[PDB]
Amino acid sequence: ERLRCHAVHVALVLFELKLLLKSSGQSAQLLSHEPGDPPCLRRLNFVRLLMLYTRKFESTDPREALQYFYFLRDEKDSQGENMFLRCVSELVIESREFDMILGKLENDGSRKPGVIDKFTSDTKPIINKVASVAENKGLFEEAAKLYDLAKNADKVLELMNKLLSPVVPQISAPQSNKERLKNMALSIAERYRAQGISANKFVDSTFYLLLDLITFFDEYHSGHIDRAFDIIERLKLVPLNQESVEERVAAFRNFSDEIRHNLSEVLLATMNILFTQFKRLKGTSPSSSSRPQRVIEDRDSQLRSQARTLITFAGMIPYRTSGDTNARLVQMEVLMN
Amino acid sequence: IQGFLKNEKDNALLSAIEESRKRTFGMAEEYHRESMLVEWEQVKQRILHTLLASGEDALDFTQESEPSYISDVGPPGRSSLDNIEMAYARQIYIYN
Amino acid sequence: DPFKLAECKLAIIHCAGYSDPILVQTLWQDIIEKELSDSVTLSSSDRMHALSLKIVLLGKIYAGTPRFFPLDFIVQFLEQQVCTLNWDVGFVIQTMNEI
Amino acid sequence: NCERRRFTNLCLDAVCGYLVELQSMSSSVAVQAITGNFKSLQAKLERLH
Amino acid sequence: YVKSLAVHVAETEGSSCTSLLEYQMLVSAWRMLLIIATTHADIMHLTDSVVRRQLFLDVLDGTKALLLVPASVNCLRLGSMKCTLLLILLRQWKRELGSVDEILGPLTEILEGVLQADQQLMEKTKAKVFSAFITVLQMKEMKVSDIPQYSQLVLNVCETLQEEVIALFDQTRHSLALGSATEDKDSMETDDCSRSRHRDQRDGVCVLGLHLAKELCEVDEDGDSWLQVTRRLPILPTLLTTLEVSLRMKQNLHFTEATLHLLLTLARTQQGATAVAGAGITQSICLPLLSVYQLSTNGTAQTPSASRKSLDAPSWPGVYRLSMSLMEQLLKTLRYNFLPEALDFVGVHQERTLQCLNAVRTVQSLACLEEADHTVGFILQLSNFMKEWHFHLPQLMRDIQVNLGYLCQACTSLLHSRKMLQHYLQNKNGDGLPSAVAQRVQRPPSAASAAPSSSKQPAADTEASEQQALHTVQYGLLKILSKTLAALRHFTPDVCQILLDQSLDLAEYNFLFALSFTTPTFDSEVAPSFGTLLATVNVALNMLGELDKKKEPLTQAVGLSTQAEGTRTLKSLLMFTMENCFYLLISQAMRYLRDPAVHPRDKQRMKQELSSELSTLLSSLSRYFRRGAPSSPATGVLPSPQGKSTSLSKASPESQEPLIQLVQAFVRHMQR
């Protein structure tokens, strides 16, 4: 125990002086013999010496664990991957010091260097290796931050769409997962639109449609309702004249599943908007509403036509909306006569 | 003849369900049986990879020391480069 | 039949469970050549879109029950019509993808 | 997601069949272009597997 | 003619076709003649397979033409009669119908005609068509490329199964509301109507639909085709809800077993296993399954009518064995993603788990060995998770360690004492005579006389049947012992750890074997020992030492392939029995040699006794492996006219197996 530090520093000396005999594979014991060497020699697994020493301080002093892995700058395995790139990717994935080790994006979308910018003239392959291992650990917010840090622009949106998807209909409460992912997505969208970035257009259009759907749900949750109508008539995720049902009933097959999984609650929100405008009309007493009565008769018919148009649309979607969402739509139209 | 023409409707329905259930029992037990033997040969090949790396009886003792786990009581906080490993790490900074 | 409501004839035999393949193929021809007939006043892109909607709509219903959706006949007949009318080669591929 | 690897074989085998057929035809500009199109398709399917 | 006459009837319904009764008479007579012309083909001179193939295809087309007219009660009646002929011809000619392609198309068209017609008339046709499809799929290995419209065939079958399983569910719920029916045990009269159809029959549309769904699942190598249909239909929840009631009531046995068969096939793929787990499998089996093996505490008459039925007979123990095999298979595929569910299941089934580890000590019947092997199989999948299992069930895991110990003692003593194994089989294959009272002694003789006749011989087939049963029972006991030794190994620290790692704890690991070198008795309370482990290696060496004696060249039998494969799998099993036994022996010997309480006298005894018998065993192992074990190096050393290099060498020799190196190293370490 008290001597591992000297054993490492003697091995680093023997390594740079090219005296150290190296064991030819990651999985080997700390010492080995090899099928070609004289039987009175041995080899050291130099990678395994370091990865059994840095692991005392990998989670506390990772700045200097990176220095010990920099002796692996020249080193490779049997696949040809670089052992500095490997051990630094494993280091960042458990030390979580993403901003310091790999650097950061500041608010303009410039890249601020980390400690790793001492050891390479391009950090992008390492940042994508860490983003991919973070993605394989389900750390999708950190993988998305790292894909923007490398400007693998499509992979940022391919994670933000998945992160926003089950979150778009939620109430925008302070500090919520919605309010975090909303302001992260808006922060990415402002960088992209300011720097002239655009991606694989199915992922790119899904990203903006999930952002504008967050404005539809927040202007519905605010009770501002007529605003959420003034949004959904522009988004055209739903029909509002029966003339447009087939247009949407086709277009649904070309939307992404992040959009499809949101459509039932967009229909319930749009139906509650219609059902509330209907209640607002029947509440605007003819003892004070100085309109021609035909400009109420108008909209007692328009809102039924729109309500039935949403029910015909729900009956033409080849994806399982729930029995509860479909019964709620029919119950709202039975209450709109 | 009516009993025989009832019976051959029985053998013409009954029998392939036994051939089907013989297929489930066989193709489940053979998949447990061969998994259990495929699981084994890598134990032998791991003994070869261990013993041919140590050699004939020429390195063993891990050295005798205290164990540690996710239990117990550790007040000292966490930085873990000691005075000597910090002096060495500082000389590696002064190298790199 | 006395009004030749082919889009209703197909729904009647679908609901009645009954499938003669000859009647079913005949009803898809009565539908396709009527949508080709009555659209004659429009441009080729517009008539491609109309025949797409007609067959993408009815193909939501009957492509669950292939006895009422003879895919191979509908593809050969639509491509023989594209080949005749000089519509685009992506057409029947898009119609079947959008079914 | 599993179908795709069964299907990329069938796509390559069928594209080989259509390229044998096309290379028997009288070598008009259309047969030359479509022989180019199917080999451009082959040279993408050779990455989908 | 009986083809064209059936097309003409389908072409003339809707006219007042006057001769329909005489047409039915001719079709009825032709059915009768053909069922007699398969069974008496020798007397009918019907031995040309080309004429048989025409007779089949003319009956197929001549059935299709009548079952595509769903509005005609006449064509449905004639078509269901010809479908009865078609199914007999199919099964009796399933070697001469040399293409499958020509049969599947018209069977899908017949199914789709039978799914346009009256359900109560055509129940007794849906069953015949599913029975035909099962028989056709059973003739040849096939893929999803080879079955015309496979995805619609799976849809039509799954939709039919959802008619049947809901109708079975409510049939099993009205029998739960109509309390107290009587045992009306006399009514000898003949074949009239309206007595209710039990849907749980081996010929039932429900039960044939489940087996057809199984044969179709065994064709979809990725599951991507079947999983599209079970995303359309809630068929897994429906099957599990009917299984749950069937298990609680001890009702619907053919359905219950056929449902577990479909689920056990689905649990083989990552997609089918996650669909079965995600359908709630553990809730609809775990508490319901308690009923099945639970005895009523009111004690009366055992009924001895257990006459010689097949082990493939549907049975309530069979339902438990398939439930254990399903949890063995789900935990093997899903692991940590079915580990809570496997711990809930082993905790609820704890008493039956401990019974089945012990039933081998008292009931050496093949059906009990088949229950024990799946019980120890599920335990062998679960003991990989020892620290999780010890956290949740710290009693039952020790109780299973002890009873796996007694099961190791029982299987090795039975396999060692081949005479006692034959004697326990003979004393449970003959019946009926009681007496008592003791005493003693002395003597004969002689004599008369005489005559005469007659002559039968004792059958050598009896000794052949005894010996085949004995070899099957020895294979069952060897599977159970092999799973037991592997499951016991996980309850010991690895040989790589307890040799090299000196701060490795020993309180985490029990003593699983007593410090004796006595050969194992078949004896109830004798805890397992190092003498038991040394006997296990000698048992396996003697069995391996009979499999290379049976090599004299008998000739002129034809038809059995499977005996070549059983002669492979039994030999790789016999290796796996020895090798887990050596892991246990070395790990438990280091567990005694390290421990501070184990007396220095008997640590020294242990170093002596094992140093002798590992040296005698390794002298015998090194006398076997010099012949070559079934392997690529042995196959490379085998040539001699061909394949030779350097002078008389072939491939390279002298790859010693690592077991022989590890047991050498341990013997050298005890000799210090």
From Swiss-Prot, chain A:
Disease: Nephrotic syndrome 12: A form of nephrotic syndrome, a renal disease clinically characterized by severe proteinuria, resulting in complications such as hypoalbuminemia, hyperlipidemia and edema. Kidney biopsies show non-specific histologic changes such as focal segmental glomerulosclerosis and diffuse mesangial proliferation. Some affected individuals have an inherited steroid-resistant form and progress to end-stage renal failure. NPHS12 inheritance is autosomal recessive.
Subcellular location per the Swiss-Prot or TrEMBL entry: Nucleus membrane; Nucleus, Nuclear pore complex; Nucleus envelope
The name this protein goes by in its record: Nuclear pore complex protein Nup93
Organism the protein comes from: Homo sapiens (Human)
Biological role: Plays a role in the nuclear pore complex (NPC) assembly and/or maintenance. May anchor nucleoporins, but not NUP153 and TPR, to the NPC. During renal development, regulates podocyte migration and proliferation through SMAD4 signaling.
Name of the encoding gene: NUP93
Phosphoserine, modified sites: 285
Location of this fragment in the whole protein: 483 to 819 of 819
UniProt similarity note: Belongs to the nucleoporin interacting component (NIC) family.
Complex formation: Part of the nuclear pore complex (NPC). Component of the p62 complex, a complex composed of NUP62 and NUP54. Forms a complex with NUP35, NUP155, NUP205 and lamin B; the interaction with NUP35 is direct. Does not interact with TPR. Interacts with SMAD4 and IPO7; translocates SMAD4 to the nucleus through the NPC upon BMP7 stimulation resulting in activation of SMAD4 signaling. (Microbial infection) Interacts with SARS-CoV translation inhibitor nsp1; this interaction may disrupt nuclear pore function.
Swiss-Prot record, chain D:
Record's comment on post-translational modification: Phosphorylated. Phosphorylation and dephosphorylation may be important for the function of NUP155 and may play a role in the reversible disassembly of the nuclear pore complex during mitosis.
Subcellular location: Nucleus, Nuclear pore complex; Nucleus membrane
Gene source species: Homo sapiens
Name of the featured protein: Nuclear pore complex protein Nup155
Top-level taxon in the UniProt lineage: Eukaryota
Function: Essential component of nuclear pore complex. Could be essessential for embryogenesis. Nucleoporins may be involved both in binding and translocating proteins during nucleocytoplasmic transport.
Family: Belongs to the non-repetitive/WGA-negative nucleoporin family.
Known tissue expression: Expressed in all tissues tested, including heart, brain, placenta, lung, liver, skeletal muscle, kidney and pancreas.
Subunit structure: Interacts with GLE1. Able to form a heterotrimer with GLE1 and NUP42 in vitro. Forms a complex with NUP35, NUP93, NUP205 and lamin B.
Swiss-Prot record, chain E:
Subcellular location, record wording: Nucleus, Nuclear pore complex
Region spans: Disordered: 437-465, 630-656
Phosphoserine sites (modified residues): 446, 632, 640
Coiled-coil parts of chain: none
Biased composition (Low complexity): 444-460
Family per similarity comment: Belongs to the Nup188 family.
Compositional bias ranges of the Polar residues kind: 642-655
Residues of the full protein shown: 1078 to 1749 of 1749
Domain of life: Eukaryota
Subunit annotation: Part of the nuclear pore complex (NPC).
Disease: Copy number variations of NUP188 gene may be a cause of heterotaxy, a congenital heart disease resulting from abnormalities in left-right (LR) body patterning.
Name of the featured protein: Nucleoporin NUP188
Its job: Component of the nuclear pore complex (NPC), a complex required for the trafficking across the nuclear envelope. Required for proper protein transport into the nucleus.
Residue(s) carrying Phosphothreonine: 635
